[PDB]
A paper describes a structure:
Here, we identify a protein ([name]) that is phosphorylated by Stk1 and modulates the activity of phosphatase CpsB in [name], thus linking Stk1 to CPS synthesis. The crystal structure of [name] shows an intrinsically disordered region at its N-terminus, including two threonine residues that are phosphorylated by Stk1.
These results indicated that the highly flexible N-terminal disorder region of [name] may be not have contributed to intrinsic stability, but was closely related to its binding partners and their functions. Notably, the ligand [name]-T4ET7EN has a lower affinity to CpsB than ligand CcpSN. As expected, rCcpS-T4VT7V has a higher affinity to rCpsB and much more than rCcpS-T4ET7E at least tenfold. However, rCcpS-P or phospho-mimetic rCcpS-T4ET7E has no significant effect on the process of de-phosphorylation of rCpsD-P catalyzed by rCpsB. The most likely reason for this is that the glutamic acid substitution can not fully mimicked phosphorylation at Thr4 and Thr7 in vivo. Instead, [name]-T4ET7E possessed properties of both the phosphorylated and non-phosphorylated forms in vivo.
Author numbering:
A (entry chain A): 8 to 88
B (entry chain B): 6 to 88
The structure:
Amino acid sequence: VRFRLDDTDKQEISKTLTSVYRSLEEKGYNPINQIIGYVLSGDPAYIPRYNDARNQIRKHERDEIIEELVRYYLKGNGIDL
Amino acid sequence: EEVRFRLDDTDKQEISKTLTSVYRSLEEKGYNPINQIIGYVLSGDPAYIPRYNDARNQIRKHERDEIIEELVRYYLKGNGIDL
């Protein structure tokens, strides 16, 4: 199963952040605080290695995550994007 | 169905009003609105926002980390990740 990952297209940001949030909770962290820390810093060290959470965040770029956060916020607050 | 109210200036500036107003001002003046907002969010520099239509004045009512905190909290709540 070493050669299984035959689709390296990025998955949905919502799927990544769901798994990262759950892993943060299991390890006893405040998940919202650690996710804010990653977005402020761009540093994956804010995310634990448990259950591949840090490797999952590394599949994305921070500026890509910020763009989705901004688009989601504006749409939910009344902007027709 | 929710109406936005124009409050007094002594009321705290709400981030939802700032960011939507900044977007509409950037768009009306011909900038790329998402791109300039990302520039602000990455840098903390109000100069990515034009002074036009009080856009820069509104972004200066907040700190970069306050805007990022609200963006994250709004996303996690809206997508059902936090509850």
